[PDB]
C-alpha cells in the first residue's frame, strides 16, 4: 500500500512541472531587449577602514546609512562612523570565530554569532556608558551563519543545523522553528515587510518562509552547487542567489521559476555575497577571485568591477539610502565605494 | 560632538594597539579528528589557542574555511581504525584538506594514534590496501604497517604541495605532544621565512 503515496507524489510533481512550463511565456531577455544598457560602472574607493587584525567575515550597515558594524575573526565587532572613519565602538567578543553580525533597525543593539552556536545581543545605549551583553540566544545545534533583527525584541537566525529560528529577545526563547532544508543554511534575507524571508542552503535550493505561520511556502532549484548568498529584490517579489557554481540566479516568487543567470566563461570561481542597489537595476556580487562584479540585473551583462582587495571578498552591503557600497575582505579591510 | 568623537577614537585605538600586541603573539591551532571547545596552553612563554570543533554536523566544507590562517591543523587519525574501512576515510579527508584552495598554505601536524592497538592487531590490513603486500620499510610487522600508513599520507602530501606547506607526522602522554606541536609550529614559521628569502 506504500505505492499510494508514491503515486500521490508522482502526480503532484508532474502537476507542478506542467504548471511551471505553462507560465513560461517569454524570457527576461526578451521583455528587456529594448532597455538601454546600464553603461559602464566606474566606482572608486572613498574610504579604507583599517583596524581589524584578521579577516572580516560579515558587515551590516545600520538604517542611518552612516554607522556600520563589521565582524572580524580577530574577535572584534567594530562600529564605525563611515563619514569620518572614526571608531565609535570596539566590542570584544567572547568567542572569536564569528561569521555574521546584525545592526538593529533602531540603532540600540548589535548581534553576532558563529562557531559558538549562539546569537549574542549587545546593548549600545546604557546610562553607565559601556556596551554590555544583554542576551545570549542558545538552542541551535550548528554554527550561526546569518541573523537579522525584525525589531528590538525579535531576531531571525540561520544555522548549519539546516534550520532557521525566530527568537523573542526579552525572554531568550525560540518561538518558531523553520525546517525543511537538507544542507547548511548559509544566508537569510528579510522581506522589506518582515512577514516573509528567504533562505539559501548547501542543498542548492532556496526556500520561502512565512514568519508567523512558520511553514515553507515555496522551494526553488536550478543551481548546481551550494548557495552561499541570498538577497531580496527591493520590492520583495523576487530574489537573487549566488553559488559555488560560479553563477548568480534571479528567481521570481509569483512566476515560481528562475528568471535569469549571471555567468561568464572566464568566471570560474564561486560567489560569496550579493546585494542589490537601491533600485535593483544593479546586482553586486563578491567573488573568491578577490573582485566584485557589477551585473546589469535586467540584461545579465557585466557592467563593472571593484578591484581593491588582495584576498577573498567576504561580504557586501548597500546603504538604505543607496549612497555607498561596503566591501569586506579576507585582507582585513573594509572599503567604501562610490 | 566632533571633539569627543576624536577623543573616543584615540582611546579605542590605544586599546586596539594593546589588542594587536596580544593577538600577534598568540598562535591558533585547529584540532580535527557548545559549538566550539577552546583550549589554551603555554610553552616557553609562547601562548597557543587550540580549537576543537565538536558541535557541528559533519558536513565540513563550509565551516572549515574559518581556519584559513591558523598556524597549523592538527589531524588525529586512529590508524588501526561491521568494521568499516576508516583509514581510507581519513586519507580522503586529509586529501580534501590538502588540496582545498583556502587551506593550501596551511601545514598539517599529523598524529597517528592507537599504535598499541596496531601492535596488537597486526598479529585485517591487507584486505584493504593490497599494495601492503609489496611495500617495504624505508616486531617488523607493526613497524611495516605503521610506516606504510604514514607513507600513504606522505604520498598524498608530496603529490601537490610545491613548497608552501608540509606535513609533520608523529606516532602518538600530553607533555610530549604539546612539545611536538610547539617544535613543529617553530619549523613552520622558519620555513615560511626561509622560503620568502628564496633559501628554500
Amino acid at each position, epitope marked *: 500500500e506504500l505505492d499510494q503515496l508514491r503515486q500521490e507524489a508522482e502526480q503532484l510533481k508532474n502537476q507542478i512541472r506542467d504548471a*511551471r512550463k505553462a507560465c513560461a511565456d517569454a524570457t527576461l531577455s526578451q521583455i528587456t531587449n529594448n532597455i538601454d544598457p546600464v553603461g559602464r560602472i566606474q566606482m572608486r574607493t572613498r574610504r579604507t577602514l583599517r583596524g581589524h587584525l584578521a579577516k572580516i567575515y560579515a558587515m551590516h550597515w545600520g538604517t542611518d546609512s552612516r554607522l556600520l558594524v563589521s565582524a572580524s575573526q580577530d574577535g572584534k565587532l567594530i562600529i564605525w562612523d563611515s563619514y569620518t572613519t572614526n571608531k565609535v565602538h570596539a566590542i570584544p567578543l567572547r568567542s572569536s570565530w564569528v561569521m555574521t553580525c546584525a545592526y538593529a533597525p533602531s540603532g540600540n543593539y548589535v548581534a553576532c554569532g558563529g562557531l559558538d552556536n549562539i546569537c549574542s545581543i549587545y546593548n549600545l545605549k546604557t546610562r553607565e556608558g559601556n556596551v554590555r551583553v544583554s542576551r545570549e540566544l542558545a538552542g541551535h545545534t550548528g554554527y550561526l551563519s546569518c541573523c537579522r533583527f525584525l525589531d528590538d525584541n525579535q531576531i531571525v537566525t540561520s544555522s548549519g543545523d539546516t534550520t532557521c529560528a525566530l527568537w523573542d529577545i526579552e525572554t531568550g526563547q525560540q518561538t518558531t522553528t523553520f525546517t525543511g532544508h*537538507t*544542507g547548511d543554511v548559509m544566508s537569510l534575507s528579510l522581506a522589506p515587510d518582515t512577514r516573509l524571508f528567504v533562505s539559501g542552503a*548547501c*542543498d*542548492a535550493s532556496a526556500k520561502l518562509w512565512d514568519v508567523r505561520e512558520g511553514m515553507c511556502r515555496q522551494t*526553488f*532549484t*536550478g543551481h*548546481e*552547487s*551550494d548557495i552561499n548568498a541570498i538577497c531580496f529584490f527591493p520590492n520583495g517579489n523576487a530574489f537573487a542567489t549566488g553559488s*559555488d*557554481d*560560479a553563477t548568480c540566479r534571479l528567481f521570481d516568487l509569483r512566476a*515560481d*521559476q*528562475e528568471l535569469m543567470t549571471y555567468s561568464h566563461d572566464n568566471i*570560474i570561481c*564561486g560567489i560569496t555575497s550579493v546585494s542589490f542597489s537601491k533600485s535593483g537595476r544593479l546586482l553586486l556580487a563578491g567573488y573568491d577571485d578577490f573582485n566584485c562584479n557589477v551585473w546589469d540585473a535586467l540584461k545579465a551583462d557585466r557592467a563593472g568591477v571593484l578591484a581593491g582587495h588582495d584576498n577573498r571578498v567576504s561580504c557586501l552591503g548597500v546603504t538604505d539610502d543607496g549612497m555607498a557600497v561596503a566591501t569586506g575582505s579576507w585582507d582585513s579591510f573594509l572599503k567604501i565605494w562610490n | 560632538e566632533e571633539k569627543g568623537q576624536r577623543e573616543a577614537n584615540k582611546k579605542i585605538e590605544k586599546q586596539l594597539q594593546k589588542d594587536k600586541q596580544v593577538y600577534r603573539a598568540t598562535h591558533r591551532l585547529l584540532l580535527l579528528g557548545s559549538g566550539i571547545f577552546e583550549t589554551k596552553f603555554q610553552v616557553d612563554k609562547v601562548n597557543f589557542h587550540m580549537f576543537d570543533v565538536g558541535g557541528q554536523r*559533519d*558536513e*565540513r*566544507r563550509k565551516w*572549515i574555511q574559518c581556519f584559513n590562517d591558523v598556524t597549523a591543523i592538527i589531524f588525529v587519525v586512529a590508524s588501526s581504525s*561491521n568494521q*568499516t*574501512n576508516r583509514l*581510507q*576515510e581519513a586519507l*580522503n579527508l586529509f*586529501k*580534501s*584538506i*590538502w*588540496n*582545498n*584552495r583556502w587551506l593550501r598554505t596551511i601545514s598539517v601536524i599529523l598524529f597517528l594514534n592507537k599504535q598499541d592497538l596496531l601492535a596488537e592487531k597486526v598479529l585485517k590490513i591487507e*584486505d*584493504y*590496501f*593490497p*599494495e601492503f603486500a609489496r611495500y617495504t620499510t624505508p616486531d617488523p610487522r607493526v613497524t611495516r604497517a605503521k610506516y606504510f600508513i604514514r607513507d600513504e599520507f606522505l604520498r598524498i602530501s608530496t603529490a*601537490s604541495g610545491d613548497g608552501r606547506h608540509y606535513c609533520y607526522p608523529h606516532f602518538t602522554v600530553d607533555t610530549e605532544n604539546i612539545r611536538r606541536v610547539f617544535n613543529d609550529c617553530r619549523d613552520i614559521i622558519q620555513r615560511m621565512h626561509l622560503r620568502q628569502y628564496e633559501l628554500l
Partner: nanobody
Amino acid sequence: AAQVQLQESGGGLVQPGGSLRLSCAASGFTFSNYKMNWVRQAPGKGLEWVSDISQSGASISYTGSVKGRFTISRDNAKNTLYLQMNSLKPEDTAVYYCARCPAPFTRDCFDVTSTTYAYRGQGTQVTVSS
C-alpha cells in the same frame, strides 16, 4: 525548475564471481566540470567511498578492496557514469550510489560520504549470493 538528479541502474542479483555493469544517468548540471564518485552502503554499515574519476577521465582512484576488479568510466557525451564489476565476492552486497563532488573545477571533494549529502542518488541494490 531543473534539479540535480543522479539516477542509478543496473543492479541486481548475481552469483559470486559474476559480472555487472552499473550505470548512472546525470541531469541538471554540466557533467564534464565535475569529479564523480561511486560510494556504497552495506547491511549495517556506514557509507564507504568506492571509486572516483576526474573531469576528463585521466585520474582514477579506487579503494583497495576492489582494485583489479572494478573499472570506472565516464561518457561525457552521454552524461553517464559506469562501474564495471568483475569477479564479485559476497562482501560486495550493498547499495551503490553515484556521488558528485560539491563544487566544480575543484580538486578537493568534501562530504560525499556524509549521511545527508545532497548531490547523491537514491542507489541500486547489488546482491551476490546463491
